[PDB]
Design an enzyme around this catalytic site. Structure first.
Site, PDB file in Angstrom:
ATOM      1  N   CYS A  65       2.528   3.967  -0.099  1.00  0.00           N
ATOM      2  CA  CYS A  65       3.962   4.220  -0.089  1.00  0.00           C
ATOM      3  C   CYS A  65       4.355   4.942  -1.372  1.00  0.00           C
ATOM      4  O   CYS A  65       4.084   4.453  -2.475  1.00  0.00           O
ATOM      5  CB  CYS A  65       4.733   2.911   0.059  1.00  0.00           C
ATOM      6  SG  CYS A  65       6.502   3.106   0.343  1.00  0.00           S
ATOM      7  N   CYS A  76       6.868   3.222  -3.815  1.00  0.00           N
ATOM      8  CA  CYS A  76       6.382   2.014  -4.472  1.00  0.00           C
ATOM      9  C   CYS A  76       5.863   2.276  -5.881  1.00  0.00           C
ATOM     10  O   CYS A  76       5.754   1.331  -6.668  1.00  0.00           O
ATOM     11  CB  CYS A  76       5.293   1.359  -3.623  1.00  0.00           C
ATOM     12  SG  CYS A  76       5.923   0.412  -2.218  1.00  0.00           S
TER      13      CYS A  76
END
Lengths: 114, 42, 49, 374
Positions: free
Chosen positions: A37, A40
């Site tokens: 991700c 993130c």
């Protein structure tokens, strides 16, 4: 002799279960993340800064959704990044925040809600 | 030998030899009286 | 044939009723005086002269 | 009514927050986030062109030259004001945004329980993004908007479900089109049948649907298509192009799409990232061949917001080219624009930060494709 570069510890579903079940004095902040991700990474740096801010006044942990996917789904995680602010008082209810929220938002939540 | 030994059951491609080469789909591709019947005669 | 796709490079390996299976091959043009590096049916790997 | 035609994005406004989450078998170092960029240029298949909140689509659509309005609710705290300011600076219409003074923006109250020996949570108070009522809708926006856009994230909230269906009735009354951009969140990947039952009503209420390849295969049959991808002939290939072991770009037949088809569906787009755009209409179907290059900028590439850019480009071309729904060649030519928009959006860190403009998208489309394909 050499300090560790990261203060946020990665926990399993069972370890987080034991942490929540056990007695807590400081607020516990749980991060749900995945290495694939993109957002993130920024959340990882922000939570490292937050952990530096709250030396012993808060606990910052992270759970990888690639190892605890079912646990994340059980805890009502709809996407990443997702944060759970768990108060030391069992009577109170935890707060789930979704998105790249500002550091000041985390500080406000910890100070005035945990 | 087996005695000098000093596990417990209780507890694609086609070979081309002449040197070996493997032939598969990576290098081979396709382009494109009673009634008399084939069979044994005894 | 006019109503057929062009056949491609290789050798006819299998012959059937309505189709043929081709083992792909690459031709290399060589003028007189060139030197072939290898016997017939010799195995050549990638990058070999 | 001013030009270009207005579009409305309905749902939650969030910063980043990719909804589509699955399990990946290639994790990087849990702490060293400097290694995580290698999963941006070797992504999980479901994360090739990730989507996001409808606010991302609205911002991208405005940046591509269109006019957009966002319909949703935020709290009256600092975070809600900052989100509204971010949407305002991008020239997204805010008049459809409802404020809640007593609610905390992007905050959800949950109660932690230990059912059957496993930790679980249940929602106590929904966030203001999921707490928009049918009485808080903006009727002028729904009247003006020509395309109504929403995601399946609202289906995870009953209040937003009811509000969404009321808004869909209002928009259909005034002549707008319904754009269903699925973007299945983490809960909706548990099993196929429950998700099909959950999304059936919204699926049948939509004129335009965009799904990813993974979403479509999950909705039809994951194992069948996984087996079909892994198949290899034992002796020889059926044609030469099958000997090259190229990446699979299988185009689903309309017969396979038949379970998911309905009468009001004007256009269905299946996106394999920016590489393939499979389109299906009641009259014809086909695929638009695209590309991607995130290795051109290995240190700034980020795939977040790419699907939002693709959807925004689709809406931008649909609002100004009504012949897309009826002409196949025009449809492919206009979908190449969305392909270019998705390609550029992968070159920057951050979804909102890297949304392309119309000029850059057209420039990249003309550079990538041959002039006869423009």
């Amino acid at each position: 002799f050499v300090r560790e570069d990261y203060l946020v510890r990665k926990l399993s579903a069972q370890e987080l279960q034991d942490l929540v079940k056990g007695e807590r004095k400081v607020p516990l902040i749980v991060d749900f993340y995945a290495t694939w991700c993109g957002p993130c990474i920024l959340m990882a740096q922000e939570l490292e800064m937050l952990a530096v801010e709250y030396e012993s006044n808060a606990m910052i942990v992270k759970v990888d959704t690639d190892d605890e996917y079912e646990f994340a789904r059980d805890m009502q995680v709809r996407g990443l990044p997702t944060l759970f602010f768990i108060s030391p008082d069992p009577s109170k209810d935890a707060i789930r925040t979704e998105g790249l929220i500002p550091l000041q938002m985390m500080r406000d939540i910890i100070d005035n809600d945990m | 030998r087996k005695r000098n030994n000093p596990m417990n059951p209780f507890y694609h491609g086609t070979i081309r030899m002449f040197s070996l080469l493997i032939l598969s789909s990576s290098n081979c591709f396709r382009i494109g009286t009673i009634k008399n019947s084939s069979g044994p005669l005894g | 044939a006019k109503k057929e796709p062009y056949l491609k490079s290789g050798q006819v390996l299998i012959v059937q009723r309505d189709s043929v299976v081709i083992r792909s091959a690459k031709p290399y043009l060589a003028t007189p005086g060139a030197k072939v590096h290898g016997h017939y049916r010799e195995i050549l790997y990638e990058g070999d002269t | 009514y001013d030009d270009p035609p207005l579009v409305c994005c309905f749902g939650a406004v969030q910063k980043e927050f990719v909804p589509v989450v699955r399990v990946h078998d290639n994790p990087m170092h849990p702490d060293i986030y400097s290694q995580w960029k290698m999963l941006q240029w070797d992504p999980p298949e479901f994360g090739r062109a990730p989507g996001g909140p409808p606010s991302n689509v609205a911002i991208s659509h405005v940046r591509l030259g269109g006019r957009a309005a966002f319909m949703g609710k935020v709290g009256g705290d600092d975070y809600g004001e900052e989100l509204v300011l971010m949407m305002n600076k991008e020239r997204v219409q805010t008049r459809g945004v409802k404020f809640d003074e007593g609610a905390s923006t992007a905050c959800t109250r949950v109660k932690i329980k230990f059912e059957d020996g496993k930790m679980k949570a249940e929602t106590v108070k929904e966030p203001p993004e999921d707490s928009l009522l049918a009485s808080e809708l903006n009727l002028a926006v729904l009247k003006e908007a020509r395309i109504f856009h929403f995601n399946s994230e609202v289906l995870t909230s009953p209040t937003m479900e009811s509000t969404l269906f009321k808004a869909i009735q209002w928009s259909k009354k005034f002549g707008g089109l319904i754009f269903f951009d699925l973007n299945l969140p983490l809960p909706l990947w548990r099993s196929r049948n429950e998700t099909r039952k959950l999304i059936k009503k919204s699926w049948d209420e939509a004129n335009i649907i965009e799904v990813s390849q993974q979403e479509l295969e999950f909705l039809l049959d994951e194992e069948y298509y996984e087996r079909r991808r892994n198949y290899t002939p034992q002796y020889f290939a059926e044609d030469f192009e099958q000997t090259k072991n190229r990446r699979d770009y299988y185009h689903y037949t309309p017969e396979e799409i038949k379970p998911l088809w309905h009468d009001d569906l004007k256009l269905l787009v299946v996106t394999d990232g920016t590489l393939r755009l499979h389109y299906y209409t009641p009259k014809f179907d086909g695929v638009v061949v695209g590309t991607e290059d995130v290795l051109i900028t290995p240190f700034t590439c980020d795939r977040t917001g790419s699907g939002d850019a693709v959807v925004a480009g689709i809406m931008r071309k649909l609002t100004t080219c009504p012949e897309m729904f009826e002409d196949q060649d025009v449809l492919e030519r206009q979908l190449r624009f969305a392909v270019a928009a998705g390609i550029i959006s992968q070159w920057t860190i951050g979804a909102v930060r890297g949304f392309p403009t119309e000029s850059a998208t057209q420039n990249l489309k003309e550079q990538v494709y041959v002039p006869s394909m423009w």
